[PDB]
Amino acid sequence: SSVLVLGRISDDPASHYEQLKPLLDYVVPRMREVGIRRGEILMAPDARQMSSYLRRGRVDWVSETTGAAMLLEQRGSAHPLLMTERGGLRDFHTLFFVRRDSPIHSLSQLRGHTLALQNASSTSGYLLPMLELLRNGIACDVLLSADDTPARGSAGYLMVGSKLNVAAFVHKHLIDVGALSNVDWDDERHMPPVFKRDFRIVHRTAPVPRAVEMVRTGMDPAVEQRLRVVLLQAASDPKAGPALKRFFDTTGFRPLDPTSRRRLQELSAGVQRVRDHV
Numbered sequence: 001s002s003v004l005v006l007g008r009i010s011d012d013p014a015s016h017y018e019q020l021k022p023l024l025d026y027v028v029p030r031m032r033e034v035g036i037r038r039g040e041i042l043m044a045p046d047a048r049q050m051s052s053y054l055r056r057g058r059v060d061w062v063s064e065t066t067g068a069a070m071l072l073e074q075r076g077s078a079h080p081l082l083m084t085e086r087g088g089l090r091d092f093h094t095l096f097f098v099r100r101d102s103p104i105h106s107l108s109q110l111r112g113h114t115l116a117l118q119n120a121s122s123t124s125g126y127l128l129p130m131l132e133l134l135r136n137g138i139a140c141d142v143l144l145s146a147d148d149t150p151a152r153g154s155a156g157y158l159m160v161g162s163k164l165n166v167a168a169f170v171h172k173h174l175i176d177v178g179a180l181s182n183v184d185w186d187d188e189r190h191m192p193p194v195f196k197r198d199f200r201i202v203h204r205t206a207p208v209p210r211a212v213e214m215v216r217t218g219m220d221p222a223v224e225q226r227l228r229v230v231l232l233q234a235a236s237d238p239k240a241g242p243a244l245k246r247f248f249d250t251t252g253f254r255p256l257d258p259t260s261r262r263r264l265q266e267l268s269a270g271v272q273r274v275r276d277h278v
């Protein structure tokens, strides 16, 4: 508690370290008056491991998309500090896409077909699309490999890891349907135009808030309130501009308000339902 530890869920810590260190370097000196003297970065491979870090006090603060953030809240390990705006957008949503020449035109026609998802900690690439399928009564069994096939009447899903893989697998006719966020859709690292032109969007989910700053269970209340004040004033500090760009292009932070609290409550119910029935 003389150290502030920032992290995130990361399948690529070599790359993501640089996203975190600049804002941490900005924050730490502004926290002296609450006993912080130094900073550290600690990332984890998935929500379950990050949750264990959080609960054990090894990580203090993470910035995550809201579904992942609810996984951490449900596991007893953290709570919301601030709503976060990235790329100028407060919200995002999941889209389902196929090859243009696919016979699939709606979400219901997933029955009989395969779906490329990301990993269990993804909001837009796992939690939201699985929630959507549960709501529509569309069964979706885990498939073991690209040779495996769904039951008739059911869909099936394959975990391919990365967002690009979701695009690549559907493009190359290995899986029928992909799930990515509407923001991922226009991001060329995740959805190359050479694949994108061969795709058609078949369904959109309702939006959720894009991201949230979470802090661990049992953080000292003085540290928590000061971190909040620091981050709230960073967005208008020019001294924080480059750091924020690097921190997932964060363009805003704001207080939790009754609306955002209720939306997180709704999303958390949905995430809990996904976890209970997957």
Ligand SMILES: [Cl-]
Pocket: 209, 259, 260, 263
């Ligand atoms: Cl909101």
